[PDB]
Design a protein around this ligand. Structure first.
Ligand SMILES: CNC(=O)Nc1ccc(C(=O)N[C@@H]2c3cccc(O)c3C[C@@H]2C(=O)O)cc1
Length: 167
């Protein structure tokens, strides 16, 4: 039993809810919140910008030190940093950005990072300003992630479409 509330069960291990991932993280305080990161950990907009804003820019300060030490992530890769006031840990995962021409096959590799964590609160990777089809992203998620994932979908219209078209 865990504290995630009001989710629709899609599969044995994947759950979804129309929710603001920032508000959901503040209420649940999960072990892991996933950020929709880029390779530079520049959290300017979309989910990343929102999570970083909710940390009063502490996420960005920590991220800049991480990059200064380690260099950029790989598309499809991840790193674990602090969750600040939102979660114990933040798993920064880089899905491909279609608006940069990145290979959509890297989406499966990106979701594989979730399997290193037993339970996660996460957005749909490569959705939103990353330019991929969220229906496709949900399908890859369900077919790749084996650990327990609670997906927060900000847009109600998209949530309903994600739900009604789900196979
Ligand atoms: C104060 N709180 C706050 O600003 N929160 C916040 C801000 C932005 C996002 C975001 O960009 N979401 C994206 C989006 C939008 C439309 C269609 C979409 O396919 C997606 C994918 C993303 C998602 O829904 O996971 C999420 C939360």
């Amino acid at each position: 039993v865990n504290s995630f509330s009001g989710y629709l069960k899609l599969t044995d291990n994947v759950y979804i809810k129309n929710a603001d991932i920032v508000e959901e993280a503040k209420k649940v305080k999960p072990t892991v919140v996933v950020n929709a990161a880029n390779v530079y950990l520049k959290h300017g907009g979309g989910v990343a910008g929102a999570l970083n804003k909710a940390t009063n820019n502490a996420m960005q300060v920590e991220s800049d030190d991480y990059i200064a030490t380690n260099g950029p992530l790989k598309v499809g890769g991840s790193c674990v940093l602090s969750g600040h006031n939102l979660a114990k840990h933040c798993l920064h995962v880089v899905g491909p950005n279609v608006n940069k021409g990145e290979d959509i096959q890297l989406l499966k590799s990106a979701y594989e990072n979730f399997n290193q964590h037993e339970v996660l609160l996460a957005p749909l990777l490569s959705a939103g300003i990353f330019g991929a089809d969220p229906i496709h992203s949900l399908r890859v998620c369900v077919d790749t992630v084996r650990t327990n994932v609670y997906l927060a979908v900000f847009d109600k219209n998209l949530y309903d479409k994600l739900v009604s078209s789900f196979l």
